[PDB]
């Protein structure tokens, strides 16, 4: 009689927040931006093909300079590419070949990797010895690493398969804050442009907006019918988009605390593996399992251009910091850089 009334109160509170969201939803993004001019067909050409990996690519991250990118493959190697000239700056041999994520530090000095080894290894690119060596191996995650992002050169937030995200201090190696509340495995996270918040999508079809300093979830967003594979913050930091297994991308909003638009098409049945926003946030690029990579209209939900030429399931997607180009990596061990031409 004690826990039953507690769960009844929880259900009542959930209904209360649901009706609050319904009341605050006077209109939708569909009718507000129906008069905006459509972007039309978007043609993207494979300017560069960063061949060199000998196994399926699972994650990549652009550098802050919009020229270098790290790509991680189940070959057991993290290769740093000079995307302008398709040159291999570094080839870091990972301790465990089961790597599911990688990151590039905002300063460019460090890169991170993680996966089934439960450890988010951090490598120091700029060393006096001239080679790249692992600096701190962050251990403490029970589940497999899914996505790691760098706050600064000393702070990194990681999402694991143990339903928990963690904020790490690289200098000490201990979790500064631990984020709890997810029911399913957390698959991706995206740092806000203002760096003071971050969202994380999990397998329980829910994306939770956390706070780095507060240490506990602030907002929870639902609506998906399957696992969430990817998440990205709209450039202004006031919204984010989710990629799920039910072949739909949803654009939630932090301030409105509810979804704004869904990006679904009857032709597409396969789930989304990676999502990323353009520099202005107008184009949302999503990577599907049908070997293709759509370019959705954020304000129109209109299929505008397809990055069809990848031969296999695209698993990672990244837009440059200046928005100059889009790099998509797939399971055919190929990274392709795409950008439009007049």
């Amino acid at each position: 009689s004690e826990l039953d009334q507690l769960r009844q109160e929880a259900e009542q509170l959930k209904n209360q927040i649901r009706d609050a969201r319904k009341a605050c939803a006077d209109a939708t993004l569909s009718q507000i931006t129906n008069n905006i001019d459509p972007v039309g067909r978007i043609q993207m050409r494979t300017r560069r093909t960063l061949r060199g990996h000998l196994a399926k690519i699972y994650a990549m991250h652009w550098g802050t300079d919009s020229r270098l990118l790290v790509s991680a493959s189940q070959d057991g190697k993290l290769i740093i590419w000079d995307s302008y000239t398709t040159n291999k700056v570094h080839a870091i041999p990972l301790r465990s070949s089961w790597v599911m994520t990688c990151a590039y530090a905002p300063s460019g000095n460090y890169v991170a990797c993680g996966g089934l080894d439960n450890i988010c290894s951090i490598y120091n690119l700029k060393t006096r010895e001239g080679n790249v060596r692992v600096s701190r191996e962050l251990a403490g995650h029970t589940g497999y690493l899914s996505c790691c992002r760098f706050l600064d050169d000393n702070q990194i937030v990681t999402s694991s398969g143990d339903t928990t995200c963690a904020l790490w201090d690289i200098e000490t190696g201990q979790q500064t804050t631990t984020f709890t509340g997810h029911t399913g495995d957390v698959m991706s996270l995206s740092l806000a442009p203002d760096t003071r918040l971050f969202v994380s999508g999990a397998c329980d079809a829910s994306a939770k907006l956390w706070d780095v300093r507060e240490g506990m979830c602030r907002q929870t967003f639902t609506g998906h019918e399957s696992d969430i594979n990817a998440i990205c913050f709209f450039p202004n930091g006031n919204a984010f988009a989710t990629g799920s297994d039910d072949a739909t991308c949803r654009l939630f909003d932090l301030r409105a605390d509810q979804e704004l638009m869904t990006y679904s098409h009857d032709n597409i049945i396969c789930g989304i593996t990676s999502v990323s926003f353009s520099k202005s946030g107008r184009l949302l690029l999503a990577g599907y399992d049908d070997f293709n990579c759509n370019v959705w209209d954020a304000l129109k939900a209109d299929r505008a251009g397809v990055l069809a030429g990848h031969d296999n399931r695209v698993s990672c997607l990244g837009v440059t910091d200046d928005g100059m180009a889009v790099a998509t990596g797939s399971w055919d061990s190929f990274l392709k850089i795409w950008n439009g031409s007049s």
């Binding site: 509170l13 609050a20 907002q219 202005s280």
Partner: protein
């Protein structure tokens, strides 16, 4: 039994999440549209820059 503690912590989390100031969707959509329009000229994917300026030419 740890079920009671889990229920209590979930109730507290919902209690915190409920007390959040939510703006109308009109203002949020207007802000998103304003941000998209302001940075449209600086987006090299929305408006493709000339091939002489593409680093990947």
């Amino acid at each position: 039994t740890a079920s009671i503690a889990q229920a209590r912590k979930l109730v507290e989390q919902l209690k915190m999440e409920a007390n959040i100031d939510r703006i109308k969707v009109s203002k949020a959509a207007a802000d998103l549209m304003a941000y998209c329009e302001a940075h449209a000229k600086e987006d090299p994917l929305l408006t493709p820059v000339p091939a002489s300026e593409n680093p990947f030419r």
